[PDB]
Design a protein around this ligand. Structure first.
Ligand SMILES: *[C@@H]1O[C@H](CO)[C@@H](O)[C@H](O)[C@H]1NC(C)=O
Ligand SMILES: *[C@@H]1O[C@H](CO)[C@@H](O)[C@H](O)[C@H]1NC(C)=O
Ligand SMILES: N[C@@]1(C(=O)O)CC[C@@H](C(=O)O)C1
Ligand SMILES: N[C@@]1(C(=O)O)CC[C@@H](C(=O)O)C1
Lengths: 518, 520
């Protein structure tokens, strides 16, 4: 029953998957170090900054009510009830920053709209959230997967991978994510060997069952993944067991997380993953590294985070061993800023800027929460916020690389992705940016380290022998058979054989015919 | 300080929502007691639970409890209350399902909240067609029909008396706005034009209605005004009409229904109005129960006193600093109480839930009649689809079984569409509503018993009638308006729309129906 409650003139609720999904009967599991703790700290950071900022909400201190979602929508929903009971000890909520997993953002949105409470997700990408008739109070600083799906399809179409398999996560993130991909797939002439899908609470066996079915399509050596972070971890693990190997092409669900591949590094080597395009918030690196169990008491999950990151123990852990070195610290050698921090910070500032514009508008005489703002009009706020356009929280250099935060009519953000390749070059395994997708694909093929040192081949049927075989398309448009030709025929084209005619015989290379002597 | 509610423990508990109180004005949330659609409907539920808890063939071995809350006729308030039902599934009583939502707005909002936790809900009065959408309201069902039909009934009454130029005024929201839209679509099909489409909204004050009465008056030919408004809104509109003593022939939906309270203090302005209401047959046993209630025996209903003191203009020692203590011999009876039109639906609703829980308990608990472990934590989704497939004969309180007195649900979870038409009369000095027809699948009403306003069957058409002597009827672009073209002194009317030359030798009759020969 942990939570962060900091009082303020106005309070923002937050939701982060601080903990991984609990297995079996338990609701919460291990600490989600990067996407959980880091993202949570980034919001605390943003709030701190805004509270030192004399040009943004001066005179109005922002407070927070942050809750753990334990990576489960139902859990996130019961937690959220805490935000609405408020509008009746309980803190009034101006708006809610949060929802990492699309499934929780969606469910929380269904609840928050009933009380007209604006919500901004810093990571949920499901296309469903764009539906403003169902999620009329939801915005996000990231784009919908309508685009990430295109980026993936075009990557495949580029390297001519026409026969690929797909495994997706049950839910609003994976299923709609994959569906979008499959549609983009047909359009680019790409067939799906097998469409696998893992679901809720699935145990090892469900995944082992998928690795097999994937292996039952040997020609399909490229497997497209649209799965939850946790699910992706399980699939790569199930592939390690039976030492199965494919070329993975996964969505941001997997992203650039090194934790997903830990303990199976060789099985995911040479994988291509996508992640939202962003640039680290330097000032945040300073803030985070300065954090330790001695100075960070406002984060009730920090000690568990600490003990797990360093394999610690103090006097606040389970009945184990190995006390912890008091000189331990989060620094440049054991920490790398999470890919979406920028979006978390921008989401909090978006809400901040929105409240500020509203405060200047309804409270023209002071910098304080006058009476007209005593009870916020959530509906209005959402459309004083949708029209928001501002330069990325100071923490972003320049202003030319369109570092402006604003929203669609749907409330979404700009669709920019970076393509990564899992490498290991220097003994260690890391993610290298090998391209990106702005509106069209773009990647320097040379820097990509493929699995088995060779640019993968993923086609339904084998290439034809030159010397004679012709390409023959059966009923579909991805599979074909190779029919050798009569020694007197030549290949008028890849698909057709033709008699060279009397007096003539085909050329050694079969491209044409030549006269016969005697 | 004191937010009232009814909490009776049981093996299984049903939540309930009723507009016990009227919408509070201005800053206050709850206002006056809604005697009929409030207290009566509340007591009808307690009545139903009581019967069910004495019934050894229904839920024997399982005692139903209740958690009833006031909606104060406001969706937002209802919503805050409903939170009580879900916090439970985490002092707090576990909710098996919720009986409730009078106003379509509260049902819709509550339905939005309740599906998040798979809690089945049955409304005994909300008629908004939106509720039929099982993709937004997948845990909502209702023992009444969708207004898709009530609108047709209304259009067909107009098309019957040939009222082609009518004005409409709807209440903002999912009840009034979708209701009228439906009507206007049924209007076009039956060639009926709409003079002016007015619409009152949330928190509107006197001036918003007066502004409407005026705009209605600026369409004098349109003497028939179609209403699709909230009960309270209807009260305001008729009050705004009484002020400027304006008078129209009102055709209102069940929002107005057959409530006498809506017309009180303006009886003459609404005389001869036609209103619809869901077709029902009083529940006799309920009459007995309700009349037997008094401030001495009925302590479980925390709103009863206020009800009492207001129905009788009372006082005891539990009222405001007023006067006139009350006669301890007062009592609800045949002379001061009439069963609210929809009570039968409240009872059928509470029973539909019971029957559902009952069939489920027999299925998952094959050994006893008690809530076995399998039902310790109800699967709401399953309940909703053990419930949709429910078909039973109206709680004993309904005679026969031939007039299809079976309660069941559409694939959408709606009930059957049957309405009764009412005429506001006063014949015996007193103003009351008289059933002057009904709509099953086709209209049907004995026009003879209808007491119109200004003793003449209203006329509601776009243009003024033509002068006999010469004018011919001429239809421009539409089929509602027309111009009157007088005819040449040598032409007669071969018919209401055509003028013709009498031809040489002949001349039109004074009458203009024929031609006569010319002398000289
Ligand atoms: C197939 O893909 C290769 C690798 O990029 C490319 O060079 C070639 O032009 C492609 N051919 C087709 C089928 O368009
Ligand atoms: C409606 O108009 C038709 C056509 O003029 C007429 O025959 C019918 O009697 C009218 N109905 C009534 C009762 O007004
Ligand atoms: N885009 C994510 C989602 O919508 O669920 C997939 C990974 C999530 C994350 O960044 O943690 C966000
Ligand atoms: N059918 C109603 C509605 O949907 O609002 C109109 C009148 C209401 C009532 O009877 O209380 C119910």
């Amino acid at each position: 029953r942990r939570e962060i409650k900091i009082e303020g003139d106005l309070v923002l609720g937050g939701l982060f998957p601080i903990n991984e999904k609990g297995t079996g009967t338990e609701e919460c599991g291990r600490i989600n170090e990067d996407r959980g703790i880091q993202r949570l700290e980034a919001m605390l950071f943003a709030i701190d900054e805004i509270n030192k900022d004399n040009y943004l909400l001066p005179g109005v201190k922002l407070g927070v009510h942050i809750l753990d979602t334990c990576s489960r929508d139902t859990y996130a929903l019961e937690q959220s009830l805490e935000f609405v009971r408020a509008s009746l000890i309980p803190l009034l909520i101006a708006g809610v920053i949060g929802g990492s997993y699309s499934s929780v953002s969606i469910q929380v949105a269904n609840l928050l709209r009933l009380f007209q409470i604006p919500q901004i997700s810093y990571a949920s990408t499901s296309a469903k959230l764009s539906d403003k008739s169902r999620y009329d109070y939801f915005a996000r600083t990231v784009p919908p997967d309508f685009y990430q799906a295109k980026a993936m399809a075009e990557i495949l179409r580029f390297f001519n991978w026409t026969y690929v398999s797909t495994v997706a996560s049950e839910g609003d993130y994976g299923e709609t994510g994959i569906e979008a991909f499959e549609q983009e797939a047909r359009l680019r002439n790409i067939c799906i060997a097998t469409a696998e899908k893992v679901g809720r609470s699935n145990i090892r066996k469900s995944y082992d069952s998928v690795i097999r079915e994937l292996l039952q399509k040997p020609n399909a050596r490229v497997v497209v993944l649209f799965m939850r972070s946790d699910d992706s971890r399980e699939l790569i693990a199930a592939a390690n067991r039976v030492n199965a190997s494919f070329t993975w092409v996964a969505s941001d669900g997997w992203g650039a997380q090194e934790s997903i591949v830990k303990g199976s590094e060789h099985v995911a080597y040479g994988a291509i993953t996508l992640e939202l395009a962003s640039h680290p918030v330097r000032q945040f690196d300073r803030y985070f590294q300065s954090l330790n169990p001695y100075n960070n008491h406002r984060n009730p999950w920090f000690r568990d985070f600490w003990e797990q990151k360093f394999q610690c123990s103090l006097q606040n852990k389970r009945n184990h061993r190995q006390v912890c070195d008091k000189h331990l610290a989060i620094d440049s050698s054991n920490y790398e800023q999470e890919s979406k921090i920028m979006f978390v910070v921008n989401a909090v500032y978006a809400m901040a800027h929105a409240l500020h514009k509203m405060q200047r508008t309804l409270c023209p005489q002071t910098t304080k929460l006058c009476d007209a703002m005593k009870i916020l009009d959530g509906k209005k706020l959402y459309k004083e916020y949708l029209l928001k356009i501002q330069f990325t929280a100071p923490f972003n250099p320049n202003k030319g690389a369109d570092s402006i935060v604003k929203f669609d009519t749907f409330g979404d953000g700009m669709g920019r992705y970076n393509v990564f390749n899992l490498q290991q070059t220097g003994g260690k395994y890391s993610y290298l940016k090998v391209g990106h997708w702005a509106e069209t694909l773009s990647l320097d093929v040379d820097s990509i380290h493929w699995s088995r040192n060779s640019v993968p081949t993923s086609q339904c049927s084998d290439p034809c022998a030159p010397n004679e075989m012709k390409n023959m398309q059966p009923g579909d448009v991805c599979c074909w058979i190779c029919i050798p030709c009569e020694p007197y025929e030549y290949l008028v084209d890849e698909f057709t054989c033709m008699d060279c005619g009397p007096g003539q015989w085909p050329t050694a290379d079969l491209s044409g015919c030549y006269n016969l002597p005697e």
